[PDB]
Amino acid sequence: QATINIGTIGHVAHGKSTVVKAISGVHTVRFKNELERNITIKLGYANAKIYKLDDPSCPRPECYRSCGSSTPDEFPTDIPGTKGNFKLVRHVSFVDCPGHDILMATMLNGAAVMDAALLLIAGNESCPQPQTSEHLAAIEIMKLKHILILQNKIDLVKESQAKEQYEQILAFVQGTVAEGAPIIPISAQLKYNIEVVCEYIVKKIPVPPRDFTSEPRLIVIRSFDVNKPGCEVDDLKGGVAGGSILKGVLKVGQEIEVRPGIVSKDSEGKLMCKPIFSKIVSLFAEHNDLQYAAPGGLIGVGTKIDPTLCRADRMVGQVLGAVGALPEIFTELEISYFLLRRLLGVRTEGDKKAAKVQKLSKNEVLMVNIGSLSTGGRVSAVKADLGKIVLTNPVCTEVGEKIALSRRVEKHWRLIGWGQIR
């Protein structure tokens, strides 16, 4: 099915299509297709069957040679082995996190359910690169360190200009685990070293310690509707709630709720909400049917929620625990937090605007990434280590793992620190 979740995370102007298909072969796609301007800004899915030929490449299903199509200038010829009915090692799953500075928040939601990351570095922009400072320290808080620094766009960028950047991005994430992350120089043009990289996504990224016997904690970050326009009356179905499960094996036919849910009718205050219970219609394994949803993987969990509950991606960051799920539904929230001394996620060649941020003031909205959830709320009483925020929607902490707090210092909320749920 899937046992791991590797994030394909990378900053602007490095290309996403030639590198994700090199490691997976299944393209990440959504609307506006009309695909993408520079790099993929959507939180897309990618799933594949990585294997070996007693050779650490990831071969194609035609596994005699690996003649890729990333350029016509030089013919990229790597030898992944030969034919002979390859042995299936494992099933690999990817979580394609957004890599622009504008979409930092949805990056934090999709990466909070994953198990691993790749750092896709362009050699084009500034060598003290801001998103490499952003993403890695964000990975450090979300209990992940499975990082492969993958310097992606150095094909026109010379070996001395590429030399400066991976040194200087590592110089600012010196308070972050990225020193156990190998820095792999590859080609987005010659599809090169993918026989070495897909070794590392097996080597550096094994199967994480994943709770199989626990309660199913699906956290949907992507909504899918099989009740598409062009359907009929006797073609009645549910809505597919497809996210990564971080805890507990999930079965077909399970009555699953969305535990943060919806506000009930005539809420004169803030505290009344009901989870939307739904029986699971099917479980997807990269092309294949199963009755089990082994967690630690991006699993298509088709549920019996309504067509409107999946006609848009409306379940971004929702704890879909089973019927009668334990974790509570908070609409006012007591947070403990720390504020990072660098305004992380934005830094130019003049080091703007990563200076020290003014403290949080009361009755000011701030994005909290609680568990893996995407919600915004104003703080009622703000202290140094005691934040009392009230949320516009009742949201569920799956567990008190981490929150990511951002302050609206510009057009988008920008990371000022992190914290935890008290």
Partner: peptide, 17 residues
Amino acid sequence: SEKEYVEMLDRLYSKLP
């Protein structure tokens, strides 16, 4: 960290013009 750089340096940059 950088031993995976310099090994894949001579592997990639000897194939780059």
